[PDB]
């Protein structure tokens with residue numbers, strides 16, 4: 001039945017991307033797949049040296065969630081990432097997710113969101129992903145019109161996060177000075193900070209810049225530096241037809257609704273893909289989609 005492995009390939013290309021790209025594309029294949037004619041054809045590659053073309057039988061009411069897909073994890077400690085000696089393994093399947101909530105920025109419910117911030121991270125010397133987790137307060141409710149609300153110490157929190165990310169990258173070599181900024185492009189230049197949010201089915205897009213207007217430095221001053229007064233909401237505009245971030249492309253999905261849905265969600269799990277490759281850059285990024293959801297609970301998604 002299930003006969004996985006534990007191998008991975010990491011390289012240079014993101015358009016010719018593999019695990020990621022494959023995981024993403026296939027997902028909307030499984031997902032777009034819930035509409036009924038009589039008999040459907042599903043694939044089923046995840047790394048076997050050949051492929052499975054899954055075939056659902058039926059006719060020509062309550063159903064779980066993935067007409068054809070399932071997940072499972074290893075086991076042992078709270079979390080790390082990769083280079084395991086992996087052993088015991090568990091059982092799981094359903095995928096109702098579309099129903100519930102989500103975001104490109106901060107994973108929702110966090111659980112024993114201990115005061116002391118976290119940077120829980122799957123490492124790769126240079127090209128890697130993070131998961132920051134602090135107790136402090138953050139809220140994020142959406143109001144359907146296309147504008148999202150908050151509550152918390154978000155300036156300060158980032159500080160912690162920025163206070164956080166300083167302790168583990170220790171003295172590299174030379175006597176140095178820090179200078180954090182963000183982007184997240186690839187091969188081309190945009191110049192905007194988008195985030196998405198799922199909560200109750202509608203797949204809503206947000207133009208998020210005021211939230212993301214901060215240049216970081218080691219030791220600073222703002223006495224003689226400048227001051228203007230700014231406040232915040234979210235100029236979201238649903239894009240059922242999804243305008244794709246990491247690539248100026250397109251996708252869609254077929255949702256439900258409760259007329260006046262006015263989103264809501266608890267913040268905890270702020271994410272990032274920090275870039276620090278040899279030279280002059282500490283490059284925070286915000287791509288970390290649906291497999292992070294389950295990755296959020298287990299340690300690391302395994303699908304098939």
Ligand SMILES: *[C@@H]1O[C@H](CO)[C@@H](O[C@@H]2O[C@H](CO)[C@@H](O[C@@H]3O[C@H](CO[C@H]4O[C@H](CO)[C@@H](O)[C@H](O)[C@@H]4O)[C@@H](O)[C@H](O[C@H]4O[C@H](CO)[C@@H](O)[C@H](O)[C@@H]4O[C@H]4O[C@H](CO)[C@@H](O)[C@H](O)[C@@H]4O[C@H]4O[C@H](CO)[C@@H](O)[C@H](O)[C@@H]4O)[C@@H]3O)[C@H](O)[C@H]2NC(C)=O)[C@H](O)[C@H]1NC(C)=O
Pocket residue numbers: 139140141149150151152153264265266
């Ligand atoms: C879905 O779930 C979510 C949960 O996430 C629900 O949303 C949450 O629910 C709470 C209550 O419904 C809500 O509380 C409210 O929060 C507001 C947050 O706004 C603040 O943050 C943002 C970002 O920084 C800013 O835009 C804004 O300026 C605010 O700072 C607050 O506006 C409200 O609380 C405060 O105001 C009222 C009225 O004045 C006070 O009663 C209350 O005490 C708060 O203010 C005092 O305390 C703060 C901090 O201690 C001080 O800064 C402030 O000056 C006040 O200090 C005075 O007053 C108190 C006495 O009251 C006294 O201690 C002190 O001596 C001073 O005199 C507001 O009540 C959560 O924040 C909210 N989350 C979100 C999204 O913000 C949501 O409803 C759910 N959906 C459904 C189903 O409804």
Ligand SMILES: *[C@@H]1O[C@H](CO[C@H]2O[C@@H](C)[C@@H](O)[C@@H](O)[C@@H]2O)[C@@H](O[C@@H]2O[C@H](CO)[C@@H](O[C@@H]3O[C@H](CO[C@H]4O[C@H](CO)[C@@H](O)[C@H](O)[C@@H]4O)[C@@H](O)[C@H](O[C@H]4O[C@H](CO)[C@@H](O)[C@H](O)[C@@H]4O)[C@@H]3O)[C@H](O)[C@H]2NC(C)=O)[C@H](O)[C@H]1NC(C)=O
Pocket residue numbers: 073074075076077078089090298
């Ligand atoms: C695989 O492993 C993960 C961690 O590695 C495991 O390593 C080996 C040695 C195993 O044999 C495990 O001991 C260890 O789990 C698992 O994470 C763990 O998952 C368990 C659930 O099976 C968690 O326990 C739960 O957490 C609550 C926290 O309390 C814990 O601490 C106190 C005091 O130390 C203890 O009393 C508890 O037993 C916990 O250890 C706890 O409140 C929960 O109890 C409730 O739930 C049961 C079940 O329904 C219910 O009957 C009872 O009445 C309670 O209401 C519960 O015990 C544990 O926290 C967690 N620990 C770690 C280190 O992550 C992982 O789940 C497991 N599964 C997978 C994914 O493979």
Ligand SMILES: *[C@@H]1O[C@H](CO[C@H]2O[C@@H](C)[C@@H](O)[C@@H](O)[C@@H]2O)[C@@H](O[C@@H]2O[C@H](CO)[C@@H](O[C@@H]3O[C@H](CO[C@H]4O[C@H](CO)[C@@H](O)[C@H](O)[C@@H]4O)[C@@H](O)[C@H](O[C@H]4O[C@H](CO)[C@@H](O)[C@H](O)[C@@H]4O)[C@@H]3O)[C@H](O)[C@H]2NC(C)=O)[C@H](O)[C@H]1NC(C)=O
Pocket residue numbers: 100101108109264266
């Ligand atoms: C993630 O989980 C979140 C909470 O998780 C908890 O789940 C339970 C089962 C436990 O396991 C906990 O360990 C765990 O933390 C969920 O977030 C919640 O979202 C819901 C709606 O989606 C919100 O519901 C409403 O909450 C009100 C809270 O405000 C109160 O607090 C203030 C602060 O002082 C008080 O002033 C207020 O008076 C409030 O008391 C609450 O009052 C509401 O309850 C009333 O109304 C409802 C409906 O009419 C009714 O059911 C209830 O009996 C009362 O009449 C209301 O329920 C909620 O704000 C929010 N929880 C938190 C953290 O506050 C979330 O669903 C889940 N999401 C994901 C990612 O899965």
Ligand SMILES: *[C@@H]1O[C@H](CO)[C@@H](O[C@@H]2O[C@H](CO)[C@@H](O[C@@H]3O[C@H](CO[C@H]4O[C@H](CO)[C@@H](O)[C@H](O)[C@@H]4O)[C@@H](O)[C@H](O[C@H]4O[C@H](CO)[C@@H](O)[C@H](O)[C@@H]4O)[C@@H]3O)[C@H](O)[C@H]2NC(C)=O)[C@H](O)[C@H]1NC(C)=O
Pocket residue numbers: 279280
């Ligand atoms: C990646 O790229 C960045 C940007 O190019 C490099 O940063 C530069 O670092 C050099 C180091 O020599 C800087 O040169 C120094 O500038 C000082 C003043 O500017 C700084 O300090 C003030 C106040 O603190 C700030 O207002 C300002 O913004 C700057 O932060 C000078 O005072 C220095 O002269 C003194 O030091 C020299 C030794 O360097 C002594 O011998 C002298 O006695 C003298 O007292 C010096 O000139 C330069 O300013 C930076 N660039 C920019 C754009 O400002 C990184 O080095 C680079 N990193 C890597 C890994 O390559």
Ligand SMILES: *[C@H]1O[C@H](CO)[C@@H](O[C@@H]2O[C@H](CO)[C@@H](O[C@@H]3O[C@H](CO[C@H]4O[C@H](CO)[C@@H](O)[C@H](O)[C@@H]4O)[C@@H](O)[C@H](O)[C@@H]3O)[C@H](O)[C@H]2NC(C)=O)[C@H](O)[C@H]1NC(C)=O
Pocket residue numbers: 181182183184185186189275280281283284285
């Ligand atoms: C994350 O953020 C990083 C920093 O913001 C991004 O790196 C930057 O990527 C842009 C896009 O390609 C590059 O911009 C180019 O700059 C070159 C270099 O010209 C400079 O050097 C010469 C020689 O000293 C000097 O004469 C000039 O005046 C310039 O100072 C230009 O030739 C190009 O036209 C183009 O503008 C940067 O090179 C690069 N910045 C850094 C830090 O080096 C990164 O793209 C982001 N990506 C991720 C991973 O999220």
Ligand SMILES: *[C@@H]1O[C@H](CO[C@H]2O[C@@H](C)[C@@H](O)[C@@H](O)[C@@H]2O)[C@@H](O[C@@H]2O[C@H](CO)[C@@H](O[C@@H]3O[C@H](CO)[C@@H](O)[C@H](O)[C@@H]3O)[C@H](O)[C@H]2NC(C)=O)[C@H](O)[C@H]1NC(C)=O
Pocket residue numbers: 137151152
């Ligand atoms: C940020 O969250 C905390 C947590 O409080 C909430 O916790 C959940 C589980 C729920 O029970 C909800 O009802 C709670 O509000 C809130 O911060 C704390 O707020 C309390 C009072 O609401 C404070 O207690 C007071 O402390 C002061 C100073 O020590 C005393 O003067 C008072 O007598 C009283 O003891 C406490 O200090 C706050 N500390 C924490 C844990 O952050 C807060 O409401 C919330 N902020 C918002 C609105 O975003």
Ligand SMILES: *[C@H]1O[C@H](CO[C@H]2O[C@@H](C)[C@@H](O)[C@@H](O)[C@@H]2O)[C@@H](O[C@@H]2O[C@H](CO)[C@@H](O[C@@H]3O[C@H](CO)[C@@H](O)[C@H](O)[C@@H]3O)[C@H](O)[C@H]2NC(C)=O)[C@H](O)[C@H]1NC(C)=O
Pocket residue numbers: 077078079
């Ligand atoms: C991942 O985190 C867990 C969570 O523990 C944190 O919990 C809070 C409350 C705080 O105390 C913080 O210090 C904890 O790290 C870690 O789980 C705990 O780990 C300790 C030691 O790492 C365990 O004690 C051990 O007990 C065994 C017997 O089982 C001894 O043989 C060992 O020598 C040691 O003394 C403790 O049981 C764990 N408790 C909890 C709450 O899970 C975990 O270690 C950490 N993993 C890593 C390394 O990232």
Ligand SMILES: *[C@H]1O[C@H](CO[C@H]2O[C@@H](C)[C@@H](O)[C@@H](O)[C@@H]2O)[C@@H](O[C@@H]2O[C@H](CO)[C@@H](O[C@@H]3O[C@H](CO)[C@@H](O)[C@H](O)[C@@H]3O)[C@H](O)[C@H]2NC(C)=O)[C@H](O)[C@H]1NC(C)=O
Pocket residue numbers: 179180181215280281282
């Ligand atoms: C991290 O960001 C800082 C500051 O960012 C500012 O500039 C851009 C990137 C934008 O985000 C804006 O909103 C920010 O306030 C970078 O430091 C400064 O970068 C600017 C932009 O190139 C430089 O300005 C220069 O100004 C002269 C004026 O004569 C022009 O002629 C030049 O063309 C040029 O634009 C300036 O060199 C930088 N200031 C410092 C600190 O010396 C920083 O480069 C960036 N670092 C990383 C990690 O990428």
Ligand SMILES: *[C@H]1O[C@H](CO[C@H]2O[C@@H](C)[C@@H](O)[C@@H](O)[C@@H]2O)[C@@H](O[C@@H]2O[C@H](CO)[C@@H](O)[C@H](O)[C@H]2NC(C)=O)[C@H](O)[C@H]1NC(C)=O
Pocket residue numbers: 115116117135
């Ligand atoms: C949560 O705990 C921190 C303690 O954090 C300390 O231990 C590690 C997390 C490490 O990062 C270390 O650098 C850090 O100091 C509390 O911060 C504390 O604030 C108190 C104020 O009473 C000070 O006495 C301490 O300097 C400081 N740390 C210590 C050692 O306690 C934080 O406020 C606390 N909050 C909650 C809700 O638990």
Ligand SMILES: *[C@H]1O[C@H](CO[C@H]2O[C@@H](C)[C@@H](O)[C@@H](O)[C@@H]2O)[C@@H](O[C@@H]2O[C@H](CO)[C@@H](O)[C@H](O)[C@H]2NC(C)=O)[C@H](O)[C@H]1NC(C)=O
Pocket residue numbers: 125126276277278
């Ligand atoms: C990010 O990683 C690079 C290189 O890491 C090497 O790891 C090997 C397993 C293999 O994948 C090889 O292709 C890859 O280049 C780091 O470069 C190293 O820098 C240190 C410090 O000077 C030196 O010990 C090495 O000479 C040098 N590379 C080698 C192995 O020759 C790079 O510094 C690191 N960057 C950061 C800041 O994380």
Ligand SMILES: *[C@H]1O[C@H](CO)[C@@H](O[C@@H]2O[C@H](CO)[C@@H](O)[C@H](O)[C@H]2NC(C)=O)[C@H](O)[C@H]1NC(C)=O
Pocket residue numbers: 174175
């Ligand atoms: C690199 O610059 C650092 C800046 O700190 C210098 O570090 C000093 O090293 C000297 C010895 O040369 C020590 O006595 C001091 O304690 C350090 N400075 C202080 C007070 O922080 C160092 O000089 C530079 N490295 C060299 C020699 O190239």
Ligand SMILES: *[C@@H]1O[C@H](CO)[C@@H](O)[C@H](O)[C@H]1NC(C)=O
Pocket residue numbers: 005006007008
């Ligand atoms: C990758 O996994 C294969 C099984 O497909 C295994 O034989 C091999 O050791 C692994 N190669 C490495 C080390 O990446």
Ligand SMILES: *[C@@H]1O[C@H](CO)[C@@H](O)[C@H](O)[C@H]1NC(C)=O
Pocket residue numbers: 001044052053054055056
């Ligand atoms: C592929 O999955 C189907 C379920 O549709 C299962 O019956 C079949 O055994 C699998 N193919 C093989 C031989 O791995």
